[PDB]
Design a binder for this molecule. Structure first.
Ligand SMILES: C/C=C(/C)C(=O)O[C@H]1C(C)=C2[C@H]([C@@H]1OC(=O)CCCCCCC)[C@@](C)(OC(C)=O)C[C@H](OC(=O)CCC)[C@@]1(O)[C@H]2OC(=O)[C@@]1(C)O
Ligand code: ALF
Ligand SMILES: [Mg+2]
Length: 994
């Protein structure tokens, strides 16, 4: 039944045609079970052993790299009897690399806790229903419950399905709806219909939602919806499909892969445009069965030269080290790519209760009557320090430490708070902190009495376990609580009947201690406490009291105010009907006013300063809470979201107010307003979505189950350490210390890491640019293979793979948190830098080829072979009278290819030094700052020498250890790339922007 809250109790029974007295018939259960299904959220584990491997090769650059491997494999059979020592190594290596990068990712992604499974923990196993089978209550499986079942719930039970309340058996039905609102405050329910068909969950006070637990009371109701048709089902549904969108950096890499395929499939064709002059002459020495292989030998040569392999290993390494670095800053990272994304955060959507606050009710203000004289009435106001449930704090009279035991009014005030209280305080020995037992608004009273200590009970020597209820127990020893007149809706108040300790039952001295809403209580007061004396409640007195409650109730404070009064002469114990709540108000009349306490969920001390740091960083903070707007706006003023006296008429909306706005004005409101209160779980994710339509990298912080849809939807989901498991499993990061200042340091790292990532991304790509040009020349000019598609691999894995990771330890800027967040669409290479790295790629491509061609023309151990005959390396064993010189097997020798490799390697060792900064010369900024970069380089060099000397290594790379004559030439070609960029750096900082 949709919108059962809008219909009456009798209208819901008619919808299913079920008797409230008997229940569903076994026939009715059969039909409903087939129609609506089982009351159960569908489990979901998308990650399987096979499907996690398939998605690894879904990358475009992987597909291109894969094909080459296939091609490499095909072109390995055909080989002579002098070079057949190695043939399958290149394809084998490509395949191995492909598997390794893919395999590592799975291990760093498969290890993920399923959020839906955690959500199903809020699904009870058993349920209590009434059916036509047996007259007694049947306890069956909760999944066997169907819409129409007459379900009974009691105190401590967990609500199985979304239920329309039929009858409340107890006086009141208190319900904890923290899974939907994020507030643990008990909600008093009723059976009256809620006319508004668009009312939110906080408004549906006649409904019982699945997953929630009964705080107190017994009730009977009818099932409205089951399974995914419930409010907790809507949470489950929003936690499916594409859980996380690609990071802005991944979008840049995906943009790179797309345009890279447009180039390789054009350059190969560009070479095809060149090879025309050879097809003219009628030659049958190289038909179509051999002349087409030349295009596949350059395709795989351009593939490994274009695709920046090794980069997935460098990024993963840098991100893994960044996690451990942030781990020491109490920041647990569950998703590595979210690190880069957090640095680009411009908007932080935050939760109020438990996140911005401590989720621990604290009484901070209280006043009693000072003196009364006619129209004059002064008060004794006090302030209480402490933001936790712990008995740590003092009472302040005009910001002075004054003992509460002196004031007789405070002695009676503490007495009421101790007795008229169904809750207690407990010290968790495992966690080492004080926790509440019962109602939060009641444990606050327990904590207050402990702080006050009106009888000066020596408690500084008691253990923390015994300290919890020390001062409260002292008061209990004075007054024996006979019984309590439980809370009523017609009263908005609660009283307890107490007799003096060690006294008869027919004795005189019993008292009733009342606690409730200020309006109703004060109106039922006819007297006023002045210390130990009593004066009549007059006009001016009542008005003065109501005035202060008005101030504490609304304003910069906005406190939950409770009035405290006692019945000096209560009815006799026998003349009080306890089975009738309608008579309780008459019992709570002729009261004597004592005092008023004010309580609130206090903000954390490190929040206001943190938000300011976010504002200084160019990041705005928005509050999205399920709490009421009144406290929401107040807390916003307390932490700096709103001004102390700023007009926020059009800067704060409720859930219902937000739903009334059209889609256009809703999207706009997310950019204007900063406070959204009394919202459903779906509202939070919708606000994030709207902000993501402005291309804003938005983050989400929370701790509750109702935050899960927003935590998942946002780019960076942040969960509190002392929060729910659902919140953690649906988040990217977890604040272990529960500090909001941790986020500031996390963003600082996120910006610092990316800047270092912004360097070796350029370093590896610029290397690949020089490799493509190198292959483009030798393929379209006539020269033999200068660099084979096997050497490049080791270059883009070990030679360049090490200095790239070494650039991840570059010293970050000092003004990194004084600059607004970078644009998500900001390109890595554009403008002058696009031309700068274009010249470098052309230099490396030229330098490399020249080196291999230097071993021919101007050589020392090579045959003088000029350019007029060097390009025709194919015509040697088939054309001798026009070409002979020396040996025929010289073009495919392991000597000139090593010369090109030695230059390429040495250049990248120099290019790594140029990649230390964007527009800062090496002369100005010392190259010896990063000791790690020198190190990567040295290791690589040795490796570059290790790959030469150790004979079983140049066997597969076709290399040769250069002598003094050949090496020295390398330094004379690679080194002037330093001065090349150096000028380019000077121009960009003297003609553009430094
Ligand atoms: C590595 C091999 C090169 C040849 C290549 O294909 O990359 C291009 C291409 C894909 C882009 C270009 C390359 O374009 C060229 O260099 C033009 C080649 C013409 C030569 C022919 C003349 C005879 C990048 C490399 O140019 C240089 C000059 O820096 C910069 C940048 O790339 C980045 O910022 C790195 C992203 C990982 C991209 O414009 C990028 O495309 C866009 O999506 C970006 C944002 O990616
Ligand atoms: F703690 Al909330 F909305 F879940 F403020
Ligand atoms: Mg919360």
């Amino acid at each position: 039944m949709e919108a059962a809250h809008s219909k009456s109790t009798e209208e819901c029974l008619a919808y299913f045609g079920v008797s409230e007295t008997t229940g569903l018939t076994p026939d009715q259960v059969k039909r409903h079970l087939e129609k609506y299904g089982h009351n159960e959220l569908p489990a979901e584990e998308g990650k399987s052993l096979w499907e996690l491997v398939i998605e690894q090769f879904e990358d475009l650059l992987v597909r291109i790299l894969l094909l080459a491997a296939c091609i490499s494999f095909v072109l390995a059979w055909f080989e002579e009897g002098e070079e057949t020592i190695t043939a399958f190594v290149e394809p084998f290596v490509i395949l191995l690399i492909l598997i390794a990068n893919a395999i590592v990712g799975v291990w760093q992604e498969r290890n993920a806790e399923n959020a839906i499974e955690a959500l199903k923990e809020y699904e009870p196993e058993m349920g209590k229903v009434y059916r036509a089978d047996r007259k007694s209550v049947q306890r069956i499986k909760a999944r066997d419950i169907v819409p129409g079942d007459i379900v009974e719930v009691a105190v401590g039970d967990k609500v199985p399905a979304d239920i329309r309340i039929l009858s409340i058996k107890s006086t009141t039905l208190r319900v904890d709806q923290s899974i939907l609102t994020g507030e643990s405050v008990s909600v008093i329910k009723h059976t009256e219909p809620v006319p508004d068909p668009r009312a939110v969950n906080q408004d549906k006070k006649n409904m019982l939602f699945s997953g929630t637990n009964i705080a107190a009371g017994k009730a009977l109701g009818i099932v409205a919806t089951t399974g995914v048709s419930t409010e907790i089902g809507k949470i489950r549904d929003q936690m499916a499909a594409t859980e996380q969108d690609k990071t802005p950096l991944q979008q840049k890499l995906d943009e790179f892969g797309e345009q890279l395929s447009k180039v390789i499939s054009l350059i190969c064709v560009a070479v095809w445009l060149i090879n025309i002059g050879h097809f003219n002459d009628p030659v049958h020495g190289g038909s179509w069965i051999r002349g087409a292989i030349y295009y596949f030998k350059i395709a795989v040569a351009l593939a490994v030269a274009a695709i920046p392999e090794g980069l997935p290993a460098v990024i993963t390494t840098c991100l893994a080290l960044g996690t451990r670095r942030m781990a020491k800053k109490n920041a647990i990272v569950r998703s590595l790519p979210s690190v880069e994304t957090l640095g680009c955060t411009s908007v932080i959507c935050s939760d109020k209760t438990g996140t911005l606050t401590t989720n621990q009710m604290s009484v901070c203000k209280m006043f009693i009557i000072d003196k009364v004289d006619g129209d004059f009435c002064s008060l004794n106001e006090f302030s209480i320090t402490g933001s936790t449930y712990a008995p740590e704090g003092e009472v302040l009279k005009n910001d002075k430490p004054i003992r509460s035991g002196q004031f007789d009014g405070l002695v009676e005030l503490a007495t009421i708070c101790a007795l008229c209280n169904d809750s207690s305080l407990d010290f968790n020995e495992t966690k080492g902190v004080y926790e509440k037992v019962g109602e939060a608004t009641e444990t606050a009273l327990t904590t207050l009495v402990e702080k006050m200590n009106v009888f000066n009970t020596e408690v500084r020597n008691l253990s923390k376990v015994e300290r919890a209820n020390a001062c409260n127990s002292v008061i209990r020893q004075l007054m024996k609580k006979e019984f309590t007149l439980e809370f009523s809706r017609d009263r908005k108040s609660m009283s307890v009947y107490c007799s003096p300790a060690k006294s008869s039952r027919a004795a005189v001295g019993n008292k009733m201690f009342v606690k409730g809403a200020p309006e109703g209580v004060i109106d039922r007061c006819n007297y006023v406490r002045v210390g130990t004396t009593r004066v009549p409640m007059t006009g001016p007195v009542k008005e003065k009291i109501l005035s202060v409650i008005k101030e504490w109730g609304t304003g910069r404070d906005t406190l939950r105010c409770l009035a405290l009064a006692t019945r000096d002469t209560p009815p006799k114990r026998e003349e009080m009907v306890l089975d009738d709540s309608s008579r309780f108000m008459e019992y709570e009349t002729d009261l004597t006013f004592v005092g008023v306490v004010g309580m609130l969920d206090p903000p954390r001390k490190e929040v206001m300063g943190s938000i300011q740091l976010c504002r200084d960083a160019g990041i705005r903070v928005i509050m999205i809470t399920g709490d009421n707007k009144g406290t929401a706006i107040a807390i916003c003023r307390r932490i700096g979201i709103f001004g102390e006296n700023e007009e926020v008429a059009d800067r704060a909306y409720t859930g219902r107010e937000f739903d009334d706005l059209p889609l256009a004005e809703q999207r706009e409101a997310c950019r204007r307003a900063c406070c959204f209160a009394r919202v459903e779980p779906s509202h939070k994710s919708k606000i994030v979505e709207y902000l993501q339509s402005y291309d804003e990298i938005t983050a989400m912080t929370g701790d509750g189950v109702n935050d899960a849809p927003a935590l998942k939807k946002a780019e960076i989901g942040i969960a509190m350490g002392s929060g729910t498991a659902v919140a953690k499993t649906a988040s990217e990061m977890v604040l272990a210390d529960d500090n909001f200042s941790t986020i500031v340091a996390a963003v600082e790292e996120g910006r610092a890491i990316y800047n270092n990532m912004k360097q070796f991304i350029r370093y590896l790509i610029s290397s690949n640019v020089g490799e493509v040009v190198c292959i483009f020349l030798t393929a379209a000019l006539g020269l033999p293979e200068a660099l084979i598609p096997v050497q490049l691999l080791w270059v883009n894995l070990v030679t360049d793979g090490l200095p790239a990771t070494a650039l991840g330890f570059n010293p970050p800027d000092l003004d990194i948190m004084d600059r607004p967040p970078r644009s998500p669409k900001e390109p890595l290479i554009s403008g002058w830098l696009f031309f700068r790295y274009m010249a470098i790629g052309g230099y490396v491509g030229a330098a490399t080829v020249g080196a291999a061609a230097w071993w021919f023309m101007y050589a020392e151990d090579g045959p003088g072979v000029t350019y007029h005959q060097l390009t025709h390396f194919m015509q040697c064993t088939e054309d001798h009278p026009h070409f002979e010189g020396l040996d025929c097997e010289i073009f495919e020798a392991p000597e000139p290819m090593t010369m090109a490799l030695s230059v390429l390697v040495t250049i990248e060792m120099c290019n790594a030094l140029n990649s230390l900064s964007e527009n800062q010369s090496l002369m100005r900024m010392p190259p010896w700052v990063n000791i790690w970069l020198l190190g990567s380089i040295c290791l690589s060099m040795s490796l570059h020498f290790l790959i030469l000397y150790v004979d079983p290594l140049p066997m597969i790379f076709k290399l040769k250890a250069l002598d003094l004559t050949q090496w020295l030439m390398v330094l004379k070609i690679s080194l002037p790339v330093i001065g090349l960029d150096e000028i380019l750096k000077f121009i960009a900082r003297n003609y553009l922007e430094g």
